[PDB]
Assembly symmetry: C2
Homo-oligomer: 500 residues x 2
């Protein structure tokens, strides 16, 4: 236990591990994709054993690339795709079925039914969330409805539930620790964010035995130590944990009320720190927990954009319009049209501020002159436009003006996209020097827990700001582009055809 | 109470690790490609640190996939691309330069000069080999010629030489052990195979200091134990070692005199076991050491075909005629032509039985109706034809009639190619149940050294038979196809153009 901390980032389509020194500098890293299953249209599943294997792989890869040995690791921090739900057998460690991903709509019939039975308001008051298949609760209900015998095993204390943080810590401790942090728990829709406890009324409503549930802890404390007889001959403290979007918020050093970031990945998620009190007005956004450290709980407002990077995957894999995902920026830069085509890629419904689960993907403004380049450019721009919807909502809700947006994520590497984002927002966009701020955030949490870094000030002193994009598009051009987006979304929301 | 053996197969374009149980069943494996460098025409280099990283990765991957723990491995067998040469600093452990691959012709001017100065008869009588850039000797000379200061450091005991086996054992032991086995040693062109020692007269001729050279040991004994603080730990015996083609011979259980195999991979290599006395006539073939075990040394005859699999990589990367390598099987199966097109892919010269370093790749029988499919089929068929050349030479030299050929290697999976091989040879072709008999060979060697398996009879009790291919083409067709090949080769050997 010495001079390095490791972060593991278990993302939607790949896992990553990174080892940092006491300066916050990257010494080694490794990344590996894992299988995505789509058994029925709208369903998305992961095999949790394959997720664990990808994590084992990248932990190995980080050590191999760094030349660092486990005995030198002070702490491990863990961050993850949120909501994605695993249920597993307590004795064998075997998942009962595939994990259901946050992307999946397979549990929508159950969410719909909860709405028809009138629970929307109660759920929102307790959890800060909205009744939707997005969150863990209906994924658990789905698994206990559909996996033969699962409900009875659960009623007999034999099955455990966990989000990915919890699953991984379980794996790493070989079953000794079944824990989750406040930020991940807050995403389950089973957790009361005001009383800070699993909500018994929701549990009863859904017939989920409380014996399935992990204990909830802060985002920065020692949860246990590795056994994992792959982590070599070392018992390393598992010491920081947060949902990926909250990890990014922390890694961006957004510690003060009002500070705001956006992470561009498979989806895009705008999170504002609101401090120790939720927020007077939640309208059209989620109220969630940012992080719990130093005895205190810090809340956040979040607007979720479900489909961002995955729209580009669709172009590649569905339409086969592009050969690779990076090729998309090459094509978009070459677009020659008037910029009047709009793609609203709401494959699973519109996220914030709309939260309209019946919307599907749509395209507008097509003409004979519309080229592949134009269509790909419009697809990329969607995430910038919806980010503005969200950020305007955040100003309205928070009554705070927003002079600056910090940004991170794989997709934020696209300079032209970031310039466009600044241009349409008419606010400065500050891109992180190290785009993987999710992993950095988890490393910070773990480092603070073990005394690797002592104080939030030692973290600040590591801050080395990145590329700044300043707005350079005139008000008339910007107002026109955004007004066309609003009309596109409006028109998308009018298509609500349901068969029979 | 340890119940598994691991084999590491460090090949020409990828490395692979497999864990076997005491019945020989594969429990887990992992394979990883690593960069191939071609700095000039005819040169082929590997970064030895990247090769080490690939082996680290696959050692992890096999543990990860199998669920087995390093404390349960009875011993590790290592097998490798032969001749490939690394020279490194004894103190830093840093290679002085890229390794020079067996494929590389960069040291040809040095080999050429040795032939001009009449050293053929003497090198062959000492080593069983021929003077060619293929073998390690001229590659070490190239490194001492061309890396500034290298000859002086070598002369001062500061640099070590190793084929890949030796490099890997050095890395695994963190610099404790500098060893090589008889089979790998015999391929350097620095090792006297009659006297079983490094040949001083060859070393003086090439000005190679003997302090560079590893100790030479048998193919089955404990060379040392792992440190490798990534091999978790667990100090596991490093216990079997052989050049890849000799490991395959052992893996096929070709333990008796006369028994013969061919391994179809990047190159193809026909090896016949000639027992405890070398073979009487070596004409047109190599005399090499098969393996040393039980205090005895088993010799072998070899015919090497440099370009087999790599002809298909050339179709993919050079001509861009196919999308991936697997696709070649599929194109060849659709070929409609008379089968009268011949491709002699001798990019770096012709191997056994020709050993003509000045021949280059060539193509014959083209007509306006020759399709891509026909071109691809002719390319694949070359290795089958040249294997007949070699097998007929072996029959000539040994007087042994050869009624059966055992086969293995990745490229042997192609049933149409394996049938064609049996067809043109008019002898039965028996494919290994497990195509990676190389790794199996290394495992057998390691297991025998630590008593995991006690005696050769325990090895034979594991034999599970593979697919048999029996000849089914009449004499006239077989004789015409082969005659055409021989004319193609003759014509290739007549093109000997050299500028100036």
């Amino acid at each position: 236990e010495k001079n390095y901390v490791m972060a593991i980032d278990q993302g939607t389509t790949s896992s990553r591990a990174i080892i940092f020194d006491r300066n916050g500098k990257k010494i080694g890293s490794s990344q590996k994709e894992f299988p995505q299953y789509f058994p029925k249209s709208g369903w998305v599943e992961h095999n949790a054993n394959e997720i664990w294997n990808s994590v084992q792989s990248v932990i190995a890869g980080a050590f191999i690339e760094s030349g660092i040995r486990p005995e030198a690791i002070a702490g491990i921090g863990i961050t993850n795709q949120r909501e994605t739900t695993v249920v597993w057998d307590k004795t064998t460690g075997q998942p009962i079925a595939n994990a259901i991903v946050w992307q999946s709509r397979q549990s929508s019939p159950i969410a719909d039914q909860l709405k028809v039975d009138g629970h929307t308001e109660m759920i929102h008051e307790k959890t800060g969330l909205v009744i939707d298949a997005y969150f863990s609760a209906t994924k658990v209900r789905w698994l206990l409805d559909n996996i033969e015998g699962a409900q009875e095993k659960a009623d007999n204390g034999e099955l455990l539930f966990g989000t990915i943080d919890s699953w991984l810590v379980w794996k790493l401790t070989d079953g000794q620790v079944h824990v989750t942090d406040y930020s991940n728990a807050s995403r389950t829709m089973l957790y009361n964010i005001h009383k800070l406890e699993w909500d018994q009324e929701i549990l009863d409503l859904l017939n989920i035995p409380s014996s399935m549930l992990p204990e909830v802890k802060s985002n920065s404390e020692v949860y246990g130590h590795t056994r994992s007889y792959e982590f070599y001959g070392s018992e390393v403290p598992i010491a920081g944990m947060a949902g990926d979007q909250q990890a990014a918020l922390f890694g961006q050093m957004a510690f003060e009320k009002g500070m705001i970031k956006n992470t561009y990945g498979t989806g895009a998620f705008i999170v504002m720190n609101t401090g120790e009190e939720p927020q007077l007005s939640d309208n059209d956004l989620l109220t969630t927990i940012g992080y719990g450290i130093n005895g205190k709980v810090y809340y956040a407002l979040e607007g979720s954009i479900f489909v961002a990077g995955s729209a580009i995957q669709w172009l590649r894999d569905g339409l086969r319009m592009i050969e690779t995902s990076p090729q998309s920026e090459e094509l978009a830069a070459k677009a020659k049209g008037d910029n009047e085509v709009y793609v609203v890629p709401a494959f699973t419904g519109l996220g914030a501020p709309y939260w309209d689960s019946e919307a599907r993907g749509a395209v507008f403004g097509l003409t004979r002159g519309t080229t592949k380049e134009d269509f790909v450019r419009a697809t990329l721009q969607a995430v910038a436009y919806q980010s503005k919807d969200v950020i305007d909502t955040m100003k309205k809700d928070s009554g705070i003006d927003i002079p600056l947006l910090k940004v991170d994520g794989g997709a934020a590497k696209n300079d032209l996209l970031m310039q466009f984002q600044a241009d349409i927002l008419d606010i400065d966009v500050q891109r992180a020097a190290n785009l993987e701020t999710t992993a950095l955030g988890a490393a910070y949490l773990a480092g603070l827990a073990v005394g690797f870094w002592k104080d939030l000030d030692e973290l600040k002193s590591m801050a080395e700001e990145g590329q700044m994009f300043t707005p350079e598009m005139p008000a008339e051009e910007r107002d026109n582009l955004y007004e066309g987006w609003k009309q596109a979304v409006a028109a998308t929301q009018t298509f609500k055809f349901k068969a029979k």
